Structures are given as C-alpha cells and as structure tokens.
Nucleic acid binder design. Structure first.
Lengths: 56, 168, 98, 159
RNA sequence: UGAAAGUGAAUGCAGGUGGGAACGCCCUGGCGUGCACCAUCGACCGACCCGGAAGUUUGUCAAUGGAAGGGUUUGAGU
RNA sequence: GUAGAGAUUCUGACGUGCAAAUCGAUCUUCAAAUUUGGGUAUAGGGGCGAAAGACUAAUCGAACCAUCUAGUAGCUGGUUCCUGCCGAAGUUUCCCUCAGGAUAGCAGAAACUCAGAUCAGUUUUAUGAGGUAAAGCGAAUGAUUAGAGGUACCUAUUCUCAAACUUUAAAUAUGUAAGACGCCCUUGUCGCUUAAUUGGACGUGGGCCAUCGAAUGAGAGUUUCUAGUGGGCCAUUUUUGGUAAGCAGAACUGGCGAUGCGGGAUGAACCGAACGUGAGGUUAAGGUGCCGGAAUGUACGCUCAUCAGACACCAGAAAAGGUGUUAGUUCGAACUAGCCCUGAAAAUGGAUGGCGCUUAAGCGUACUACCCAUACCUCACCGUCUGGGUUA
RNA sequence: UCUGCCCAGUGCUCGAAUGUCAAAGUGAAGAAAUUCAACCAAGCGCGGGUAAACGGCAAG
RNA sequence: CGAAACCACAGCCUGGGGAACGGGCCAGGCAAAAUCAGCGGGGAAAGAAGACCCUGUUGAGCUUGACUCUAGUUUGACAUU
RNA sequence: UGACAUUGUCAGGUGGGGAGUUUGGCUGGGGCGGCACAUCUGUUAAAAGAUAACGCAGGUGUCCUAAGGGGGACUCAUCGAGAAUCUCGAGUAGAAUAAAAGGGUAAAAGUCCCCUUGAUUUUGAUUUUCAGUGUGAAUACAAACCAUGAAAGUGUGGCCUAUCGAUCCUUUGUUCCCUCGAAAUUUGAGGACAGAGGUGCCAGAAAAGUUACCACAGGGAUAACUGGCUUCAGCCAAGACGUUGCAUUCUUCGAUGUCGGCUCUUCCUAUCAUACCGAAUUCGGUAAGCGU
RNA sequence: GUCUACGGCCAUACCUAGGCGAAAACACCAGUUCCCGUCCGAUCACUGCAGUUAAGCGUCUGAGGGCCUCGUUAGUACUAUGGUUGGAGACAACAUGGGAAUCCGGGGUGCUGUAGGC
C-alpha cells in the first residue's frame, strides 16, 4: 500500500493547469478599513465622471 | 564492543625523525572493510617479524586504519589509495620492511600494495625538500615528530623556538 | 489550575457593553427533567416488549472534563459562560503563589 | 513514521545563519511594500509570529494586501494537477524585495530611454536581449607567446 | 427569506469597471457601439447585530408600533 | 454347544459388488435384564434413549412436506453481432475499512468561449532558496593514536573518524520575473492615511506604439454528465529492515499490465523499434563455417586446456598459486601484468542453441563488404481527422 | 478393608440489623399537571449450619 | 450377449526457459502399419466447488457470571370480599 | 378450612429451563503480544515540497492566575584570586526558558520587581493536515471594551513546533425574543442563539465463550502439506593468530493421498572392503568394477 | 581633517600588549538642596565645573589571535547524462556537461548618510 510512481505522469496528462487570471480581484481578503474606503472613493469617482460627462 | 586492536604504534615509537628517513606504506588498492581483528593479527605478525629480523629499535610501525565503523564488532572502512600501515626505517632495512609488509598482506582481505614513499619518514615533505629545510634550520625535532617554521605568528614567538633559523 | 473568584472582564450585557466585575463560578449540569421531549419519547419507546431499544454507552475513556466558568455580572446580574482547558485539579479563589 | 507538525523537519531551514544570530537588522522595517510588488519569502527564526509554512520558504510571490505589520503574498502551489492560489499573511521580517523585479524595472527604464534617443535620431533601436552569439573570427599573435609543446605525464606514486 | 411570528425585491437607461459577439465608421489598424458570458465594484429584498422616528390606543409618562440610518456579515434572492 | 440372537478377527472376498452394508471362515451369547409376531401409546426444539448425540422410514448436533421465497450474496461462475474513432487505473482522503464503498485523479461523449493570444515535463538572461555528496577535526561537540615540553594536567604538535557532529558546501532537481492589465505626463474621487493634495488605491485626458522588449515550438481555455480503476509488477540509479533471498519497504524515470514486431537459442517488462493494406529501397539491435539470409573476409597478436573458450541483462565463483607461456618494471633476481591451468567438490543421458571449431568457426583491437524488422524513405489504396472550394 | 483435614470462595439452607426499595397508599406545598418527606414486602446486605455440595489441601 | 467411469486436444524421450518439476514452446536424441497378453513408472490418472488453515461485518449445536428479554417462580397492592 | 386462599390486572425480584442477537480492525497466515488506531521532535529521506515498513531514538490525553499580558532594571553557566556567605576580575551563552526533542533568545524571550486580566465580545479573510470537506492548531486584520507604558508600541493565553470531539439526546447561558394553530391568563413544553456532557477503535455501532459433531460462500489475495529460492578444504608464519571458498509465500485450497518398514531398480563419490602404486600394524593418490 | 548627536551595513568594526592625542567636544570629576532609588547617591536621579588626560575614547605599532578578500589546493573530491564499456564483485576508466572544501601563501584591519561643533 502506497507509492508515487504513476501520480506525476497522471498529473501532467492534462497539464499542471494554472488558475485563470482576471483583471480585478475581489476586495475581499483586503483590509476592511481599506475596502470600505475604496467603496466611497469609487462611488465619488463614478459620480465625478458622470457629472463631467453630463456637463461636457 | 571493544576493538581487538589497541596499540597502533610499535617499535621505536620514541625515535626522532632524521635517523629514520625511509618510509614504506602498505596501502589498500580496493574499497573494502577491514576488521579490527584482522588489523590486530597483522600488527602481531609485522611486529614479530620485524623484531626477529631487524630488532626492536630498527623500525617504527604505525597502523593508520582505525576500526570505528560498527557492523558484535568493529571494522575499518578503507578506500582506494588509503594507507593501512606505515613503517619508517633506515635505508638499509628497505628489504626487511618490504618483506614484513608483504607477509602481512596475506592477513588482509582484498588487494594491498607496497609503495616506498617519496616523503621523508612520516613528514609531509619530500626527502630532498626535508634535507634542504633541515640544513636551513626551519625544522626542529620534537619527540616522534618535528615542528616546521611557518610565516604566521609573532617574530619573537618563532625566533625563540627556532634560534638557529637563518631568515633571509 | 487556580482561578480567582472575581475577575474584571468585558460584559456583553445590553446595559454594560464594557468591562465589569464578574463573580466566577464553575458551571454544574442541572437535574434531568422527566418532561423533556427526549425523555418522553424514550419512555414511550422503552415501554412494552422488545427489550432495551436505545444504545447504552459503556466505553468511557476521558478522565477529565472541560471546566466552564459562569460569570455573574455584579451590576446587571448578566451571566456569561467561559470554557477553559481540561484540568485534573480545579479550584476557585485559592491562595496566591509565594 | 512521520509527525506532521507545522515546524517538522525545519531544523536547518529556520536556523539562523552562523554568526548571524541575535538582534534583527532594523532596515527590514523601513521598507515599504505596495500591492503588485514581487517579494521573496525567507523565514526568520527569531520572529515566531506571522511565520509562513515551511513550503513558502524560498518561494517568490506578488503582494496583494498590505497590513499594519504584515504583508499578503500570493503564491501558486502545486496541488495534484493544478495550481492553487495561496494567500499567506507573512510578517515583513520574513519578506524581502526581489532583485529580479528591480533589475527588470531598471531595464524597462533603459529601454524606454534608448527608444527616446532612437526616435530623436530617426533610427531603429535594438531592445530585445539576445543569447550569447557564436564566437567571431579573430587573429591570435604568437609574438613573445611561442606555443609550448605538452606531453602527458608518466605515472608516479605520490600519496 | 426566516426555526418562527412575519416582512417581502428600481438613486441611476434596472447601475459602474475589464474582456467581448455582431455591426457602423476612418485611413493594416484606429474610433464608436456593446448581445451571451465570466472577474469585479455598488444598489434593492429577507434573516442576523444595532438603532427608536411617525403613527395606533390601551396603560400616554406608558403600551403597541416599528420609518430614517448603520453593518460591508448571511440566503438555495432582485 | 445346535435352532435362534449377535458381530470379534481375517483390517479375507467384494469394493461402477449378489448387496446404497453383502459373502466366507473364525468368533460372542443361547432358559433369560432372553428372542419375537400382531394390537396399542409417545411426534420435531418434540419423542425416545442400560447414554452412542444414539434412534425417530437408506434423512438426525434438530426428520420429512408445502409455503413465505425468485430469502439474502462486500464471494464464485457465465454474460450472445461487425467495423470505425478515443482510451485507463491500482494512487489521495474518509469509512467496524483491509476481497467492499464514497471521494479526488486518470478516461469518454456533448458543448461553449477565446485567438496571435496565453501558454510550455525546454533552454537562456536576471535573481532567490536549500544543508545532500564531498570536505573538515592544528574549528565548536563527540570518539580515538603517539610522544615532547610546561607541571592528574596545561602548551604547541600528531595518527584516525562521525546516520541523530559541523565552520564551509556542490551536481541534479527548485520559486519568480523577462511589459500594452506596459511606460511617461496631466488630472479627479475618498468617510482611509498624512504635519499637509502628503500619501494610498481606483480613475480620467493625453503622449511613445508590434524589435511590443530573450531562444524555440505550438492555436488556447473553461464548463457539464458519466464509465472503468481504487490487488499491481519489472528495470536503471539512490536506499531502508534483513545472515541471506526470484525477500519485505520506499524515492526519480522508463517499461509490462494493455503490446505485437527484429535481436538475446528459448522468456510479460533486457537491446532495437512501437503496428492500417501492399510494392520497392535503406537501416536499428544483432549478426555472416553449417543448421541460417549474409566474407571458411582483411591486418596484428595472445591461447593448447586428460573433459579449453565462446558476447551485456544471464543463468553464476574466490584468496593464493604454476620450472605454463607471452610481455613488461626495477635492482642473475625480485616482481607487475594478460591468456591458460590448479584451487574446483553429485546424484536419469545432455547441452557456447546443435554440429563441430585450434596460423579458430576462441580471445583483444582496427578495417571494409554484406544480411534484414510491422522502424525510416518514395509510391499505390483503405479509413479517420483537419483545412480550402462548390447555385452550376 | 478404609473413606483424612478444611465452610475461605461459590452453591444450598434457616435467624437478624433497619441497611435497601418498586407499585398502591400516607403526609405537606401547588390553581393543577405534580414536587418533596416518611413508610413497604420479597430479593440482597448482615449471623448460623452444611463438603458421600462444587471444590481446595479457611485448611495445609 | 454387453455396460460404465473418464474424455480441452492429445499421447516417445533429454535439456533449457517459464506461474520456480512440459505431451505441446526452444535446442537436440530421433521416427514405419495393424495388433495380443500382462503391467502398475507416468499422465502433477479418476472420484468430490479441501473436511485442515484463513477470509466473510455467513451460519449453527453447546456454554456461562456476555448483551437484551422470557415461561415459571417468590413477594406486594387492588379487585372477588 | 374459610373471608384467608384460588383466580384477575399491575408492581418489585428471581429466571441459561427457554428465546433472539453479539463476541473490533491492523497483522510477513491466524491466535497470544504490541498499537505502528488520534497525535509531536530528531532521524529513515536521497540540499524545494512530497515519500513506506510491527524502521530507529524518544514524547502526548497534561501543567500554569502566572509558568498569561505590559513596562522597568539587571546578567547567566563556569574558572581564577581571598576573607570565620560576599568581593571584583574575566565570562558568545558553555545556564535558564513547566513537560519529549529540535529551532529561537543577552540593556532578552533569561533572573528579580511593579501594575494587570488581550486566557474578553463580534465578524468575515487566510495557513497547515486536505477532497483544498470536517476537526484541531495557527496567522494577519476589522468593529468594540480594556490592560500596560512617559511614550512609540505591545497584548485575542503559554517564545515556536503536540496536549483533542459530529448528528441525536440532555444540560447551561442569552432575548423586555418566537410557537403551543377557536380566544385568553398562569404553569409546562417546543424553538432560535452560544457553550458544555462523549464517543481514545479519537469523521464518533450498544456486545462473553465454545465446537475433535460441526456447516456455507470463497481464498493459493492466506497457513500446514508438498516444489522452488534462501543459510569441510585452500592460503599466511608463531597448526594458534587471521583470512578465501564449497526465513520467504512464487506455484497448488472445484483436493498433487501425509511418516516408517517391506519390495525393487538406478545414479553420484565426498571410498568401508577388494585391485594398483606411494609415504613412517599408521596415513595418502588413481579408482564407484563388484560387494557392503 | 577631528569631535558630538542620530544612524545604515553589523569584526577590514572583535580580543590583546605597547607608543601617541593641539584645539573644541566628550569623559573622568565635586556635591546630595531638591525630583528620584538603593544596604550604600557607589548604580540611577538632580546641581556644578576645581583639576585630569590615568582610563573611556581616537590613532599607530605587532611577519599578534581573529576576521574579510585574492590565489594554491583543483579541473582534485563529488556529481547530471551515455555505452551489448572493463571487472566474479568491489569498484574503475572513458564520452558529453557542472564543479567544490580544508591546509597553504599574498593583500586588508572599517566604510558611509543627516544635522551640527573645533
């Protein structure tokens, strides 16, 4: 019972596939103080862009 | 368990350096294990033959194999080119020393070879280099060995030990 | 283990929400009520022919129990439960090390 | 049989260097780490808080979170047939900047510079590193360097 | 949605960001536009943890009621 | 002692018999607890038993019959036509689990997106990490040899070691980076942060713009459902327990299982090479005296064996020897090396595969010519897959 | 012709502390379901007998 | 006059290798129809899903101080009263 | 005899006379052992990680109101010198740090002193063993409340690496909480939430033997039994001393008849006798023809 | 250039013997009212500058111990890949790559950032 002979061959059969890399990650895993700040900054940035678009 | 061999130096072990210039090595040619019991038996054989032929004070025999590896008993792990025995004698006892080591080859397993060393006795210098440095005074005997001059250390700490040394 | 009979710790009471003096007591298991639904269901199932109908635990292995501290808030009588590690020798409010 | 503790078989990995024991250098706390930075994890045995697992010693990853006294590092760990993202909260005592990323940033700065003067002069600039080319043809003069003939040496008995 | 009593899904063009199908436009690319999809940031509904404004009658001080707002937690949601 | 009743021995006969218990001879008992007919009672967890778990219709440590019942089955055995495409696992985790399941992996179908991208069982450039091999003991620790000095020590030495000792420290494997999610400038938001628009994070508006920032090669990725498997074995190298093992247990890679074919006489994993149907050519490993396709080839040597030698894995042998011989090395002598011989010692007749072979058809080395696999090459045909056309 | 010693244990057997205790009943608390308290037989605990009882050589 | 058992196909050896004792494979020795009476070396001869051992979350007869119960039995209480 | 007993229902007890079940798993076959069954350190282990044996040397089911948290001051083990225990010189840790072992530590993590309860409450996010499930242990934060310090800061138990537990049931804490469904009040019960009680066979059944009377399904995955494999002479000189040679479980459990004797044959030589020589009735060489 | 304060790398900076140090700075130093702490103002705390370079401190010397680099060791030890290579085995050589360590010898005995003082 137990051996590791075939497992590496079985592993590379379908490659050692990397996880998909996305542009934005979740603001989870981040500091709660930082995360709530970024909400307020992003909320104001969205408002600022919309007002600038409306006035231009 | 206690090793069967306890004495590694036999003969005139208190002898100096200059009177015994010739050195002959019994070296193992094969990678093998040599039992402490076999080392003791060869030691007895070599000592008995050398004392019978050349006397007690005409040789110094040193066993360089130490049985530290354990297998009930101990064995000495030896490599290719590792020296097993070393006999330092005068130039006249060359045949006696060679015959003594050749007879003791039969007590050892594997292949053993007899080589006359180019070094002066048990020293690390060749015979010509030792003679030159002895003449120049950088070598002073100390019991069974000799102290050699070295560049490091204080000048007074080396001059008091080596008074007749002629520094250039 | 030695635990002082009184300690100042945070009280989760509605009116306290701060550190208050608490009297420490060891939690003791209360009496088993015969009116509990498990006891009532057990009695009806056990009644009648069929022998014993529920597992009876004979393989007791642990010799020590986790000690639970019940903290009586001095101000608002709020009680809080704290559990410590297992200890063979337990005592409340003993003499200090000297 | 094994024992599977967190610090099992870490006798030599977490050991302090010879004559490097004692107080930790203070410069470790004065370096700023930002998200996206490349950092090499090297566990310091003196600080037993915030230690990563013995797998992460010697691993390099990208910082994703910066904390009061710690750094969040993103490592990819081989689990069977895939790469898993492992997010290790490791104190800055066990973290150092990767010199490779610096060197890349300086090379990027140089490449942008060479591009600027190339456009200013109207020439095209070679910006891509090349593997070592085969040796070029060159003359070798024998003046005062007359070749000495060598023969293999005979066997000698020198122990 | 909650164990229940119960409450019960639009700040916005039913919302921003990145990639995108298809089309348009311009001199291989560029600009506009973005279906489906996933990364993601927020809003709404319910549970939970706070918070007690109207109103209701019945004890008005109280009883009942539970809007505003706060969580950056939770759901097999909008 | 006969009739009658038994059934000791021959372990006789017979042993698909006359017989699903008999026949022969011998032997026990034979006037009583004797032998027996018919009638009658006791019935299956019951009877009955001078007791053997005996007997209870050739059925007895629980009879027989029919039912519930097609009881149940992690166990054994079988499981029915063809071709085409793809193609495993014996490993992880949990289980009163170890002959079994669930679970992840391997695997098949069906899709969906993405794209010169986003990648690699690879190298390079850049930069990390480690304490194995070696090395060391006049460096710590631990073990150990020998004198000399200074007074059991101390000083400088010296001989020799270490799996749990070590300053130092490889080789091979190992983490990451090598850009358009780029760079530079401007500029906005925030309740975070700072002494402060100071930072920080996300942005805006511009600018450089496929030599777009190493080599090489490939199109790439994700979803869904499910089968089988969850006994493995061999070889290389590293290695543990073991007196040893065609022994037990591991680590990396390749094979066998699942795989034919040429060679090793023969053989699951050794060497070469991987396979659609054929023609021609040329090769691998191995070979060319005959069996056997192919030089009883070329050059220089060694060997004489009263049961020589003959090609890796592999079918097994040693120290030490020789008035064997051919060479070498050093002072006639000691040696050092090859071949041969001795050491060498089993049982049906018998195995370089056989015959045989001796200026070999043995052994070592070089050199050409030649032989042939389903391998490679050109071609024809079959099928699959892939891409380009097709409103005449 | 004899059948030795042993009641410790186990088994059997006839006397007791008040040590136990169920169902009924009794006493109190409650608005009640009920909750406490006391009492209860037999069986056991305690004491005696018994081995041509099981057995051991308390007895050796 | 007239069965049966048994029967993959069969039937000469030696060695090799191989699931480690071949009738078949590989290399040899060899090799002549059809038969009769004997015979017990071989066919790892036949007979029977090893009866010993082990495995099974398969049984059963027996036992006891196993687990859970039970006919009976002793005692109490109520009813008959 | 006599309102007892006998019967009827219930309640104790007794009850292998009888009934139904059970009587772990791993394991160089099983049984007896031991726990390699949950677990930690140094090794096996071959310089990332991962890696086995009933491999090796040891541990663990605790201990602690400080041996936890913060701050200050101090330096330890030893050695030398000299006074009827303390004194100053050196002192790289050679001491201590609860417990096994390794790592870590000197104006400290060590030894004293002072104040303390961050060993607290609520989230989510990570790491390890991993299926990236659970459990356990751990890391970095966040929202409160605090300890401490002049402060920076540190603290969510022990300097780090082990010291542990589901469903069901029961029990406790908590809410001016929810329900008992015709309407209420009061008891009682049932919920939500957070703990604990316990499963050491530690992802967690309630469980004594025996068969030689034994029975089934299987097993050469597994023993006995047969096969295979594995374990006297020559060298050296004082014939001592040395040295070199001549258990496993692969096959068989739809069966290979199991010791000895008797009988009969054949082979080997490692020679008892016979034949032939050789060495001082005693020892060797050729020799398996014949006998034994 | 020298000194002080704060440091960075943390011995080329450490340990030891000896010889120097002008200015300033630093240090030794006098005292115990107070703040403060001890058996003891010796340490710590506070007030001051009367003398001193004796020490700290800076610097120099020693073929000093040590430490850091360069070479020797050394293409040695070891190791990745390969052979129907050698050898009974042990092991060894070769082909294509990587490549140490001690001993030994040469050199070296801190450099530097900010703010100041002489």
């Amino acid at each position: 019972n137990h051996t590791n002979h075939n497992q590496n061959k079985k592993a590379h059969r379908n490659g050692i596939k990397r996880p998909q890399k996305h542009r934005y990650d979740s603001l989870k895993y981040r500091d709660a103080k930082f995360r709530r700040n970024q909400k307020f900054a992003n909320r104001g940035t969205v408002e600022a862009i919309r007002q600038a678009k409306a006035s231009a | 368990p206690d090793s069967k061999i306890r004495i590694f130096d036999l003969g005139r072990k208190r002898a100096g350096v200059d009177e015994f210039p010739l050195c002959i090595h019994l070296v193992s040619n094969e990678y093998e294990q040599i039992t402490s019991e076999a080392l003791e038996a060869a030691r007895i054989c070599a000592n008995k033959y050398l004392v019978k032929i050349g006397g007690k004070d005409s040789f110094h025999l040193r066993v360089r194999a130490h049985p530290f590896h354990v297998v009930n008993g101990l064995v000495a792990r030896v490599n290719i080119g590792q020296i097993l025995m070393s006999v330092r004698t005068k130039d006249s006892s060359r045949a006696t020393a060679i015959e003594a080591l050749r007879r003791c080859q039969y007590k050892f397993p594997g292949q053993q070879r007899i080589i006359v060393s180019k070094k002066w006795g048990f020293s690390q210098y060749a015979r010509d280099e030792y003679i030159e440095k002895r003449s120049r005074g950088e070598i002073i005997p100390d019991g069974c060995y000799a102290k050699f001059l070295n560049k490091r250390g204080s000048l007074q700490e080396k001059l008091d030990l080596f008074p007749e040394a002629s520094f250039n | 283990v030695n635990i002082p009979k009184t300690r100042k710790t945070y009280c989760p009471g509605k009116n306290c929400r701060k550190h208050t003096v608490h009297r420490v007591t060891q939690y003791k298991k209360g009496p088993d009520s015969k009116l509990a639904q498990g006891k009532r269901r057990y009695d009806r199932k056990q009644s009648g022919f069929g022998g014993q109908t529920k597992p009876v635990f004979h393989k007791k292995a642990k010799v020590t129990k986790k000690v639970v501290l019940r903290l009586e808030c001095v101000s608002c009588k709020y009680k809080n439960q704290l559990v410590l590690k297992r200890c063979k020798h337990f005592e409340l409010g003993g003499e200090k090390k000297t | 049989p094994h024992s599977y503790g967190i610090r099992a078989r870490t006798r030599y990995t977490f050991q302090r260097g010879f004559r490097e024991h004692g107080q930790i250098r203070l410069s470790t706390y004065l370096k700023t780490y930002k998200v996206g930075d490349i950092v090499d994890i090297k566990v310091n045995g003196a600080v037993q808080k915030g230690m990563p697992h013995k797998y992460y010693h010697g691993k390099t990853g990208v910082v994703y979170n910066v904390t009061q006294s710690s750094v969040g590092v993103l490592i990819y760990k081989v689990v069977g047939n895939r790469y898993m993202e492992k997010r290790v909260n490791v104190r800055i005592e066990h973290v150092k900047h990767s010199k490779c990323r610096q060197d890349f940033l300086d090379r990027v700065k140089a490449n942008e510079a060479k591009r600027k003067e190339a456009k200013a002069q109207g020439k095209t600039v070679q910006l891509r590193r090349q593997p070592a080319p085969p040796a070029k043809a060159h003359f070798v003069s024998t003046e005062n360097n007359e070749p000495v003939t060598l023969h293999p040496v005979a066997y000698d008995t020198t122990i």
